[PDB]
């Protein structure tokens, strides 16, 4: 179906403990495929997925250089941010960036992204039109003015419509065994007596990929959204994810509850119930 490629940057200052650390991780959908850490013994882009290993040595040298240059540029970005916000050089600060593209089943660009944050808050972001910007405050507005003057959006757009989609398409083909395979969730409902008046029904979804999934409990056909405990989807460590939804139900009324599961790896949504 649809696919995405995203690069995530994290630049962290640490006054008194050396220069700011710069990390980059790259993903195709929910699969990590490349990493870079300026604190590494010999910093360089490293493969994290089998299908990216075939990229030649030229690819790795070029990718590593981009990250090394980025390390220096983001340390300067951090210094600039301090000025824009009138902050002292004593505190630790963080700049983050997420950029990339989404493509459809046919491989055409669905939309591009280039978003930035400062200390966990929106800073500036490229609009979906790939030609204008949205600045979060008067500080980011200064960056916006510089970027509008330098036609940055036009350059981002060229990358997003070109190399971004072209490389993603190559990665999808080279990694079609995994990137183009959805693993359906293995499901089951557990029963845990709480007391004489209530019992807990927990609906499990395990071993699925991608991470996107919907788990809901219904009581007599009515969604129990407000009464369902939903844990955040979590990684199993073997590429797959896990998730569960629980509800407290009155003793003897277990059969009035049904768990519904939706996942792209499932031809049709599943309906489960406690099976004593």
């Amino acid at each position: 179906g649809s696919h995405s490629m995203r690069y995530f940057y994290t630049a962290m200052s640490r006054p008194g403990r050396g220069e700011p650390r710069f990390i980059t991780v790259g993903y195709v959908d929910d699969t990590l495929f490349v990493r870079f850490d300026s604190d590494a013994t010999s910093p360089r882009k490293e493969p994290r997925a089998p299908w990216i290993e075939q990229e030649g040595p030229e690819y790795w040298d070029r990718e590593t250089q981009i990250s090394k240059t980025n390390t220096q540029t983001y340390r300067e970005n951090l210094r600039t941010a301090l000025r824009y916000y009138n902050q002292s050089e004593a505190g630790s600060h963080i700049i983050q960036r997420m950029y990339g593209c989404d493509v459809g089943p046919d491989g055409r660009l669905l939309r591009g992204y280039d978003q930035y944050a400062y200390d966990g808050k929106d800073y500036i972001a490229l609009n979906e039109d790939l030609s204008s910007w949205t600045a979060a405050d008067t500080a980011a507005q200064i960056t916006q003015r510089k970027w509008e003057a330098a036609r940055v959006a036009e350059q981002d757009r060229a990358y997003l419509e070109g190399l971004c989609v072209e490389s993603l398409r190559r990665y999808l083909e080279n990694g079609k065994e995994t990137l183009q395979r959805a693993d359906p969730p293995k499901t089951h409902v557990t029963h845990h007596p709480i007391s004489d008046h209530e019992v807990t029904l927990r609906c499990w979804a395990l071993g699925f990929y991608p991470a996107e999934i919907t788990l809901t409990w219904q009581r007599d056909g009515e969604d129990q959204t407000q009464d369902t405990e939903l844990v955040e989807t979590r990684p199993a460590g073997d590429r797959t994810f896990q998730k569960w939804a629980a509800v407290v139900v009155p003793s003897g009324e277990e059969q009035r509850y049904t768990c519904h599961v939706q996942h792209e790896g499932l031809p049709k949504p599943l309906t489960l119930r406690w099976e004593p």
Binding site: Y7, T24, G26, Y59, R62, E63, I66, S67, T69, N70, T73, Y74, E76, N77, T80, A81, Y84, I95, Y99, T143, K146, W147, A150, V152, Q155, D156, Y159, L160, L163, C164, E166, S167
Partner: peptide, 9 residues
Amino acid sequence: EEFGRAFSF
């Protein structure tokens, strides 16, 4: 593949 152009804040 990454975009090799970085623009200063």
